[PDB]
């Protein structure tokens, strides 16, 4: 961690994040998720400032932004809505 | 580079690099996401340039002239010129257009 090697392998890591094989993509996102704190502002700052997205190539890396920010959301809360007028009673 | 660079072009180049890219004089990366974009710089310069300056030409000019000059500064030359050179450029173009109109 922090070696020149991890700096040199960034294109490979970004290939893992955009991988078409979901198990690889999940393992790489799990590494990616823990690299920053579970906070909205810090992750928005990450995607604006820290991540060079050039190595993604032609990939629509907004997918990774969605994945990164939605990870902040609370997971154990029961599913629900504000749309009480649309709910089946 | 075949037409000479006006002080207004150099000033637009320097200000584009400083204001828009928010990069320092030596283009050292401050944030990894913020790599230099010489296409944007070429677009800014060409808004007021006397001829199309490519992004490669803008990069070469910046690195080979403005970096040594900032290390009279481009701001000092721009202030001292008082738009005279660029005015004389347009005067010359107006004279050539009047010459062409008269030749009809």
Swiss-Prot record, chain A:
As for subcellular location, the record says:
Nucleus
Q: Which residues form a coiled coil?
A: none
Q: Spell out the family assignment given in the record's similarity comment.
A: Belongs to the PI3/PI4-kinase family. TRA1 subfamily.
Role played: Adapter protein, which is found in various multiprotein chromatin complexes with histone acetyltransferase activity (HAT), which gives a specific tag for epigenetic transcription activation. Component of the NuA4 histone acetyltransferase complex which is responsible for acetylation of nucleosomal histones H4 and H2A. Plays a central role in MYC transcription activation, and also participates in cell transformation by MYC. Required for p53/TP53-, E2F1- and E2F4-mediated transcription activation.
Disease linkage in the record? Developmental delay with or without dysmorphic facies and autism: An autosomal dominant neurodevelopmental disorder apparent from infancy or early childhood. Some patients present with intellectual disability and renal, cardiac, genitourinary systems, as well as structural brain abnormalities. In some cases, the phenotype is less severe, has no systemic involvement and is characterized by autism spectrum disorder and/or intellectual disability, sometimes associated with epilepsy. Affected individuals manifest variable dysmorphic features. Deafness, autosomal dominant, 75: A form of non-syndromic deafness characterized by late-onset hearing loss that involves mid and high frequencies, and progresses to encompass all frequencies.
Copy the domain comment.
The PI3K/PI4K domain is required for the recruitment of HAT complexes, and the MYC-dependent transactivation. Although it is strongly related to the PI3/PI4-kinase family, it lacks the typical motifs that constitute the catalytic site of PI3/PI4-kinase proteins, and lacks such activity.
Whom does it interact with, and what assembly results? Answer: Interacts with MYC, E2F1 and E2F4 transcription factors. Interacts directly with p53/TP53. Interacts with GCN5L2. Component of various HAT complexes. Component of the PCAF complex, at least composed of TADA2L/ADA2, SUPT3H, TADA3L/ADA3, TAF5L/PAF65-beta, TAF6L/PAF65-alpha, TAF10/TAFII30, TAF12/TAFII20, TAF9/TAFII31 and TRRAP. Component of the TFTC-HAT complex, at least composed of TAF5L, TAF6L, TADA3L, SUPT3H/SPT3, TAF2/TAFII150, TAF4/TAFII135, TAF5/TAFII100, GCN5L2/GCN5, TAF10 and TRRAP.
UniProt name for this protein: Transformation/transcription domain-associated protein
- First and last residue shown, out of the full length, are 2431 to 2519 of 3859
Swiss-Prot record, chain B:
Where is the protein found, in the record's own terms? Answer: Nucleus
Report the SS bond pairs. none
Ranges for domain Myb-like: 1-66
What does the tissue specificity note say?
A: Ubiquitously expressed.
Q: How does it assemble?
A: Component of the NuA4 histone acetyltransferase complex which contains the catalytic subunit KAT5/TIP60 and the subunits EP400, TRRAP/PAF400, BRD8/SMAP, EPC1, DMAP1/DNMAP1, RUVBL1/TIP49, RUVBL2, ING3, actin, ACTL6A/BAF53A, MORF4L1/MRG15, MORF4L2/MRGX, MRGBP, YEATS4/GAS41, VPS72/YL1 and MEAF6. May also participate in the formation of NuA4 related complexes which lack the KAT5/TIP60 catalytic subunit, but which include the SWI/SNF related protein SRCAP. The NuA4 complex interacts with MYC and the adenovirus E1A protein. EP400 interacts with TRRAP, RUVBL1 and RUVBL2.
Question: What role does it play?
Answer: Component of the NuA4 histone acetyltransferase complex which is involved in transcriptional activation of select genes principally by acetylation of nucleosomal histones H4 and H2A. This modification may both alter nucleosome - DNA interactions and promote interaction of the modified histones with other proteins which positively regulate transcription. May be required for transcriptional activation of E2F1 and MYC target genes during cellular proliferation.
- What protein family is recorded? Belongs to the SNF2/RAD54 helicase family. SWR1 subfamily.
Q: Would you tell me the protein name for this molecule?
A: E1A-binding protein p400
Query: What is the species listed in this Swiss-Prot or TrEMBL entry?
Result: Homo sapiens (Human)
Gene that specifies this protein: EP400
């Amino acid at each position: 961690s922090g070696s020149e090697l991890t700096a040199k392998l960034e294109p490979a890591f970004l290939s893992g994040l955009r991988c078409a094989q979901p198990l690889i993509r999940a393992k790489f996102f799990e590494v990616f998720d823990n690299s920053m704190k579970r906070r909205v502002y810090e992750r928005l700052l990450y995607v604006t400032c820290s991540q060079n997205w050039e190595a993604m190539g032609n990939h629509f890396w907004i997918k990774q932004c969605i994945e990164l920010l939605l990870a902040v959301c609370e997971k154990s809360t029961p599913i629900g809505t504000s749309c009480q007028g649309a709910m089946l009673p | 580079d075949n037409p000479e660079w006006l002080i207004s072009e150099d000033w637009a180049l320097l200000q584009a690099v400083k204001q828009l890219l928010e990069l320092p004089l030596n283009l050292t990366i401050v944030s990894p996401a913020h790599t230099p974009n010489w296409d944007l710089v070429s677009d800014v310069v060409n808004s007021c340039s006397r001829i199309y300056r490519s992004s490669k030409q803008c990069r070469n000019r910046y690195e080979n002239v403005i970096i040594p000059r900032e290390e009279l500064r481009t701001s000092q030359i721009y202030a001292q010129d008082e738009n005279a050179t660029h005015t004389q450029l347009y005067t010359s173009h107006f004279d050539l257009m009047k010459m062409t109109a008269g030749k009809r």
